[PDB]
Amino acid sequence: MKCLFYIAGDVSNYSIVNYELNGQTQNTFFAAHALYNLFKPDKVIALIPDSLVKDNVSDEECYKNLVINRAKELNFAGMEEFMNKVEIRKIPNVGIASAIQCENGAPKKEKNKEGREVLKRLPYNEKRSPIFIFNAIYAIFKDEACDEYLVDLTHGTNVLVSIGMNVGALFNAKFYSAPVMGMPGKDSIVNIVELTDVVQATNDSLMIRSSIENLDERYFKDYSAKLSRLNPTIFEEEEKKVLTRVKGTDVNVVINFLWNIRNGFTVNAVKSMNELKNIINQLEEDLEKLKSFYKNWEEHKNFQGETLLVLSDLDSTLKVKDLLIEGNDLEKLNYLLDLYIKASIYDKALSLARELPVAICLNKVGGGMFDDKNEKYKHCNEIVTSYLRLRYSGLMEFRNTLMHGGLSTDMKPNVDKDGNITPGKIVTKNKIEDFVKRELRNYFDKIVNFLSSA
Amino acid sequence: MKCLFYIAGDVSNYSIVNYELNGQTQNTFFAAHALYNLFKPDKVIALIPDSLVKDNVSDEECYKNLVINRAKELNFAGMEEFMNKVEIRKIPNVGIASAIQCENGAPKKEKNKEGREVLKRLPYNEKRSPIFIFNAIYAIFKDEACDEYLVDLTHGTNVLVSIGMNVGALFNAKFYSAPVMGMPGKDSIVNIVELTDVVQATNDSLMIRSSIENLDERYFKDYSAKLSRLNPTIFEEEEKKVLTRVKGTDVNVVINFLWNIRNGFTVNAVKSMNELKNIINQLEEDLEKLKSFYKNWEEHKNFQGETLLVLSDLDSTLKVKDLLIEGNDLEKLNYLLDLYIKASIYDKALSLARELPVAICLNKVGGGMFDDKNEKYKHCNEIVTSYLRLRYSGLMEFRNTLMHGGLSTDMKPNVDKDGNITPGKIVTKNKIEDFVKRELRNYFDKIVNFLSSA
RNA sequence: AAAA
Incomplete structure (x- = not known):
């Protein structure tokens, strides 16, 4: 269930040209046909604006004719039968306009000095919010229920093109555009660029930034596959020397670092900090x-076809420099606490703030393993447990409650004979939220300042 | 440190108009100058695609001398100054165009049939990857170091406009477009559009979808503020009846639901399921x-300039219907297990899988509190603890391994002098991923099935 | 609305 989405434009200027995507040249005056036969979608849909044509009955019927009314020039038959297929639906538009009125089922023609040619009407000065148009296009897209979404761009106002792109972006659409300026001419060869990646590359960079910001390892889009298939043909010494370094960037380490943080592996997460x-x-x-090479793109036309390279994918990976600090593994963990607080991952933040003072004390008592067999641990853990339990009574509750979560001796739910579990305690979202984010840091520093003179 | 950016186009056709931005007016011909005089940015970076210059001297300065040669045609005197210090950064382009040759600095003009014009030898044809242009624009943006990013897409090819939008999207730029489309004429009036709304609305919907997908409330963009401020001055009662319901959609419940799932509060998370x-x-x-209203937008012209209502923000919130199941609170939790497995949140998945069979058995006993005082719990927890520790030796280890975390009696790290820590057990990153995602479900059903016997 |  493939379906082609076609943004409309002024047909009264369209010159004939031949398109080229993966070879298979086809020629006409507009993309809609060239892409229809190329992909062979189940149903093509025409997205036409309000500021384009206007008549008493079917403005919708005027487009179906106006496109054949232009196909008639040079006796172009492969269009009359293609118009029985495509469904024409109207979309809103913003701005002052030169429209094209219709007398009835055919476009009107005004013989004013030049000769019998199409007429103009500028009183359309519609003040609309872009979000309104976006909503109107979103609805037409949602109410199609397609498996694959393919959207021909190239045509339409720069505003509607921008709008349609964002709507399509949500429907995981494949974007195509035939870049051609004025006076293209007969039998001209024009590539039909696929912008999909450019889009699903901008998204990737935002996901990579969010991955860092919230210490997640499933938001990060691993571009090691793109980097794996690198080393393109015509290569100059200086570019290849830089690119061969980039090609071998150990991105999987940054992923593992974020994984060992989300799943709470400070021992290994903090250790990796120096390598990263x-x-x-x-x-x-x-x-x-690379920024230098792309800032002087005129000398790097070997990067000409690089669909496997993205500066944004790399620059967004640079954000991890924030998650990194210098010092002893103990000092590095003290920072990791604050990262667990800024990202609202409470569970790990409390557990870390609970066990760090054990490790702090072990360092000042000569050091010792986190094993119950070790006496310097055993006693040293009792110092932090007992100090916490009589002073920060809340630190202990909040930690244990989050550690076991639902169904625990900490929450005491009744379960019921029927099976309708009923909670025992409450502890609202903004209970934990306030404690961790406002006192958990202040409280921690007060604990470590106590264990300092130990 | 505000700075404007603009995809530059064919200035030779550009006609005078009177631009409108929420009250302030501006009388300029080309788009950029109107926004420059308005926002008054510290810098204005630009330069066209390579597809309109090939002069022997500076390809850049040529644009500087032709832009002003169009300013001289019309009655003007103040577009050579304050516009002289504009940053001209050249960008690559794709397809077939007609690129104005240009002489030493100013353009090269010739006459064929017509009295005088700028000779169109203009043979532009370049095969480039869209990612290359995106990279070239990205580098220009990054190498500007602006505080605020402002970007024009009033002009340019539909390809470069799409590209520039995605590049701007990362610098969280404010997008503006002046929709004209044709023959504005003398004293033309054009009310500009800010597309910034549409961009950080498409992103929001993707964040809302992944918020659901990975059970993380932090990714969810709370639109309750937009909905709070949804007070159109004049709207129809039908329109009123639907929107007044939408206005009061308590989205904060879906946020709280995700917060409970993310922090392990399955008790309260499972109970809220039927409310949601x-x-x-x-x-x-x-x-x-709303989707019938917007699919027939021509009827409800009242949301003509309503930049507050959004359909994608709401439709993406419907994704939570997946996280929801019907049945007793016990079998709702059984589903929640699979939701903790599908999203790779291991820690909670195992804790739930270990503690669910305690609750299952309690239900078989007629129900009991999950308090150590309760004998029906005490013994019933010993049945699940002993059965687990005798067969699923691995379930118990991995569970404490994700519960206590790195710094623990479960990992046994060493910590010597000068704050250095060395791990005791190597993390089994793949041994966790494979166990939870392959065995934990099968293992759980084998324990519950045994419990069902008694 | 094939660089308004």
């Missing part, structure tokens, strides 16, 4: 050279 | 009328 500090330092001076 | 069943069922209808 070297990864990003190299990724900075690599991207700086 | 009712919430989405209500938004499944009106959404239906």
Whole structure:
């Protein structure tokens, strides 16, 4: 269930041209046909604006004719039968306009000095919110129920093109555009660029930034596959020396680092900090050279066809420099606490703030394993447990409650004979939220300042 | 540090108009100058695609001398100054165009048939990947170091406009477009449009979808503020009846639901399930009328300039219907297990899988509190603990491994002097991923099935 | 609305 979405434009200027995507040249005056036969979708839909044509009965019927009224020039038959197929639906538009009125079922023609040619009407000055048009297009898209979404662009106002792109973006649409200026001419060869990646590359960079910001490892889009298929043909010494470094950027380490944080592996997450500090330092001076090459693109037409390269994918990976600090593994964990607080991952933040003072004390008592067999641990954990339990009574409750979550001796639900579990305690969203985000840091520093003189 | 950016086009055709931005007016011909005089940015970076210059001297300065040669045609004197210090950064382009040759600095003009014009030898044809142009624009944006990013898409090819939008999207730019489309004429009036709304509305819907997909409330963009401020001055009662329902959609419940799932409060998360069943069922209808309203936008011209209502923000909230199941609170939790497995939130999945069979057995006993005082719990927890520790030795280990976390008696790290920590057990990143995602479900059913026998 |  493939379906082609076609943004409309002024047909009274369209010159004949031949298109080229994966070879298979087809020629006409508009993309809609060239792309129809190329992809062979189940149903093509025409997205026409209000500021384009206007008549007493079917403005919708005027477009179906106006496109054949232009297909008639050069006796172009492969259009009359293609118009029985495409469904024409009207969309709103913004701005001053030169429209084209219809007397009835055919476009009207005004013989004013030049000769019998189409007429103009400018009183359309519609003040609309872009979100309104977006909503109107979103509805027409949603009310189609397609498996695959393919949207021909190239035509339409720069505003509606921008709007339609964002609507399509939601329906995981494949975007195509035939870039051609004025006076293209007969038998001209025009590529039909696929912008899908450019879109699902901008999204990736926002997901990569969110992945860092909220310490997640499922928001990060692993571009190691794109980087794996690199090393393109015509390569100059200086570009290949930089690119071969970039090609081998250990991105899977940054993923593992975020994983060991989301799943709470500070021991390994904090240890990796120094390695990543070297990864990003190299990724900075690599991207700086790439930024230079792309800032002088006129000399790097080998990167000409690079669909497997994205500066935004790399620059967004640079954000991890924030999640990195310097110092001993203990000092690095102290920072990791604050990262668990800024990202609202409470469960890990409390657990870390609970066990860090054990480790702090172990360091000042000569150090010792986190095993119950170790006496320097055993006693040292009792110092932090007992100090916490008589002072920060809340730190202990909040930690344990979040650790076992639902169905625990901490929450005491009744379960019921019927099976309708009924909770025992409440502890609202903004109970935990206030504690972690406002006191958990202040309280921690007060604990460590106590264990300092230990 | 505000700075404007604009996809530059064919200035040779550009006609004078009177631009309108929420009160302030401006009388300029080309788009950029109107916004420059308005927002008064610190910088104005530009330069066209390579598809309109090929002069022997500076390809850049040529645009500087032709833009002003169009300013001289009309009655003007103040577009050579304050516009002289504009940053001209050249960009690549795709397809077939007609690129104005240009002499040493100013353009090269010739006459064929007509009295005088600028000779169109203009043979532009370049095969480029859209990602290349995106990279080239990205580098220009990054190498500007602006505080605020402002971007024009009033002009340019539909391809470069799409590209520039995605590049701007990352610098969280404010997007503006002056929709004209044709023959504005002398003293033309054009009320500009801000598309910034549409962009950070498409992003919001993708964030809302992943918020659901990965059970994380942090990704959800709370539109209750937009809905709070939804007070159109004049709207029809039918329109009124639907929107006044939508206005009061309590979205904060869906947020709280996701917060409980993310923090492990399955008790309260599972109970809210049918309240939410009712919430989405209500938004499944009106959404239906909103999508019928917007599919026949010509009727409800009242939301003509309503930049507050959004359909994608609501439709993406309907995704939560997946997270919802019907049945007793026990079998709702059984589903919640699979939701903790599908989203790779392991820690909660195992804790739920370990503690669910305690509740299952309690129901078989007629129900009991999950308090250590309760004998029906005490013994019944020992049945599940002993059965687990005797067969699913792995379930118990992994569960404490995700519960206590790195710094723990479960990981046994060393920590010596100078704050250095060395792990005791290597993290089994894939041993967790494979166990939870392949065995935990099968294992759970084998325990519950055994419990069902007694 | 094939660089308004």
